[PDB]
């Protein structure tokens, strides 16, 4: 099995910009009739692969030619002229001229763009749910950028560790931030014991926490 | 050219299972068909092929004894005595040169848990207010939120599920104007396709 390798694992590149993924084989792609068959693919979050350039520098039906391939033997390079918010997905090269058909590992393509505070929103439980003696209280943090940012959950001034969930989104394809939901789980009876429930978010954009909280 | 795939199957360890492959939009005869493995946070892995013509089939040294590739205009699949290695995305595509066309992919989940339907809340507390759909304790994973039956997809953030105690949590949210809500009301709907669920929630203050 021919390994392919890709560089770097990650790159973070502004709109406008100029992007070069490579890919190497641990043996060469020549075919004995000639052809080079080395592709790439872009994969969208959600989607299944679809193919840009096959071999080395064709390009399938539709793409534009801000995508084009280089290279040989062992070496290839796919190039982004002008990188555009749609770029965004994971880049996979791989080759069809060995058997088995082998793939590389990945690059995920990160927009740069300029900093932005996540706007946050509190919700208590619903009555559908107390009613059924769960409590989970939920922030939504979003639209920032960058997306390391720092969540806590505060139950009358006493910081909340356990039962607490985070998920973050993917990098927005239309405005390149981030989102994430912090959800506190308690039961219906730790809930109703206390007054305000608070979501504490330390991010780049601020030095003070953003700060949103809730009195029951 | 399309080629219509399951979607998603629960499979028990040990079990068996038959993914099927429809082609249309093209010859189906006049390409070779593969097979690709995808986990989750993984490459890709190539699995196999079958020629339509006749049923001459050639795979992958580590799928030789997974796989077992014949057709019909469908072309199927079978994996044998699976386990949660095998938990998985696959897809069948036809990979030949400018003739690329994908499934959408079967996610495939071998797993002995039992299939549990969502609980939907509502999630209901500036110039924009966020709203949002609680959906937790289902499996297996799938499940699709839409807000006013997809009409509304502008300010929509869809969050990926997490597994708290054995079961799937998600959530989403929508951003309308102020003066909208609750004038006008959005309302989440939730499909969950693996235990055939299909539960609106109206937002109200
Ligand atoms: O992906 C592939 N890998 C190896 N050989 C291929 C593949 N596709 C086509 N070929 C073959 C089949 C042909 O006789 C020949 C030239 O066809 P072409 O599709 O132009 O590369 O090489
Ligand atoms: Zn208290």
Same mark, same amino acid.
């Given at each position: 099995?021919?390994?392919?390798?890709?560089?770097?694992?990650?790159?973070?590149?502004?709109?406008?910009?100029?992007?070069?993924?490579?890919?190497?084989?641990?043996?060469?792609?020549?075919?004995?009739?000639?052809?080079?068959?080395?592709?790439?693919?872009?994969?969208?979050?959600?989607?299944?692969?679809?193919?840009?350039? =096959?071999?080395?520098?064709?390009?399938?039906?539709?793409?534009?030619? !801000?995508?084009?391939?280089?290279?040989?033997?062992?070496?290839?390079?796919?190039?982004?002229?002008?990188?555009?918010?749609?770029?965004?997905?994971? =880049?996979?090269?791989?080759?069809?001229?060995?058997?088995? !058909?082998?793939?590389?590992?990945?690059?995920?393509?990160?927009?740069? !763009?300029?900093?932005?505070?996540?706007?946050?929103?509190?919700?208590?439980?619903?009555?559908?749910?107390?009613?059924?003696?769960?409590?989970?209280?939920?922030?939504?943090?979003?639209?920032?950028?960058?997306?390391?940012?720092?969540?806590?959950?505060?139950?009358?001034?006493?910081?909340?560790?356990?039962?607490?969930?985070?998920?973050?989104?993917?990098?927005?394809?239309?405005?390149?931030? =981030?989102?994430?939901?912090?959800?506190?789980?308690?039961?219906?009876?730790?809930?109703?014991?206390?007054?305000?429930?608070?979501?504490?978010?330390?991010?780049?954009?601020?030095?003070?926490?953003?700060?949103?909280?809730?009195?029951? | 050219?399309? &080629?219509?795939?399951?979607?998603?199957? &629960?499979?028990?360890?040990?079990?068996?299972?038959?993914?099927?492959?429809?082609?249309?939009?093209?010859? @189906?005869?006049?390409?070779?068909?593969?097979?690709?493995?995808?986990?989750?946070?993984?490459?890709?892995?190539?699995?196999?092929?079958?020629?339509?013509?006749?049923?001459?089939?050639?795979?992958?040294?580590? @799928?030789?004894?997974?796989?077992?590739?014949?057709?019909?205009?469908?072309?199927?699949?079978?994996?044998?005595?699976?386990?949660?290695?095998?938990?998985?995305?696959?897809?069948?595509?036809?990979?030949?040169?400018?003739?690329?066309?994908?499934?959408?992919?079967?996610?495939?989940?071998?797993?002995?848990?039992?299939?549990?339907?969502?609980?939907?809340?509502?999630?209901?507390?500036?110039?924009?207010?966020?709203?949002?759909?609680?959906?937790?304790?289902? @499996?297996?994973?799938?499940?699709?939120?839409?807000?006013?039956?997809?009409?509304?997809?502008?300010?929509?953030?869809? @969050?990926?599920? &997490?597994?708290?105690?054995? &079961?799937?949590?998600?959530?989403?949210?929508?951003?309308?104007?102020?003066?909208?809500?609750?004038?006008?009301?959005?309302?989440?709907?939730?499909?969950?396709?693996?235990?055939?669920?299909?539960?609106?929630?109206?937002?109200?203050?």
């Amino acid at each position: 099995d021919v390994v392919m390798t890709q560089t770097p694992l990650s790159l973070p590149v502004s709109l406008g910009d100029q992007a070069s993924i490579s890919c190497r084989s641990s043996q060469s792609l020549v075919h004995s009739n000639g052809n080079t068959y080395l592709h790439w693919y872009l994969q969208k979050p959600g989607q299944s692969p679809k193919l840009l350039i =096959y071999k080395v520098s064709n390009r399938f039906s539709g793409v534009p030619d !801000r995508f084009s391939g280089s290279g040989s033997g062992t070496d290839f390079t796919l190039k982004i002229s002008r990188v555009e918010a749609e770029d965004l997905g994971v =880049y996979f090269c791989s080759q069809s001229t060995h058997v088995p !058909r082998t793939f590389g590992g990945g690059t995920k393509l990160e927009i740069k !763009r300029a900093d932005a505070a996540p706007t946050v929103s509190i919700f208590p439980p619903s009555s559908e749910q107390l009613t059924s003696g769960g409590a989970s209280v939920v922030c939504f943090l979003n639209n920032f950028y960058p997306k390391d940012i720092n969540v806590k959950w505060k139950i009358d001034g006493k910081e909340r560790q356990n039962g607490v969930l985070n998920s973050w989104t993917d990098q927005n394809s239309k405005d390149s931030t =981030y989102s994430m939901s912090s959800t506190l789980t308690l039961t219906k009876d730790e809930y109703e014991r206390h007054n305000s429930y608070t979501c504490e978010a330390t991010h780049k954009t601020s030095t003070s926490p953003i700060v949103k909280s809730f009195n029951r | 050219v399309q &080629l219509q795939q399951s979607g998603a199957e &629960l499979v028990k360890p040990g079990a068996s299972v038959k993914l099927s492959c429809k082609a249309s939009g093209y010859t @189906f005869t006049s390409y070779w068909m593969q097979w690709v493995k995808q986990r989750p946070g993984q490459g890709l892995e190539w699995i196999g092929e079958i020629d339509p013509s006749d049923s001459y089939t050639n795979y992958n040294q580590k @799928f030789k004894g997974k796989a077992t590739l014949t057709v019909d205009s469908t072309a199927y699949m079978q994996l044998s005595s699976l386990t949660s290695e095998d938990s998985a995305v696959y897809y069948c595509a036809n990979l030949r040169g400018y003739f690329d066309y994908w499934g959408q992919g079967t996610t495939l989940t071998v797993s002995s848990a039992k299939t549990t339907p969502p609980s939907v809340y509502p999630l209901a507390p500036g110039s924009s207010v966020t709203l949002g759909c609680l959906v937790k304790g289902y @499996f297996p994973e799938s499940v699709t939120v839409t807000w006013n039956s997809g009409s509304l997809s502008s300010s929509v953030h869809t @969050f990926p599920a &997490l597994l708290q105690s054995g &079961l799937y949590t998600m959530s989403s949210s929508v951003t309308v104007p102020s003066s909208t809500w609750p004038s006008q009301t959005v309302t989440c709907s939730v499909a969950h396709p693996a235990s055939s669920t299909t539960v609106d929630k109206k937002l109200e203050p």
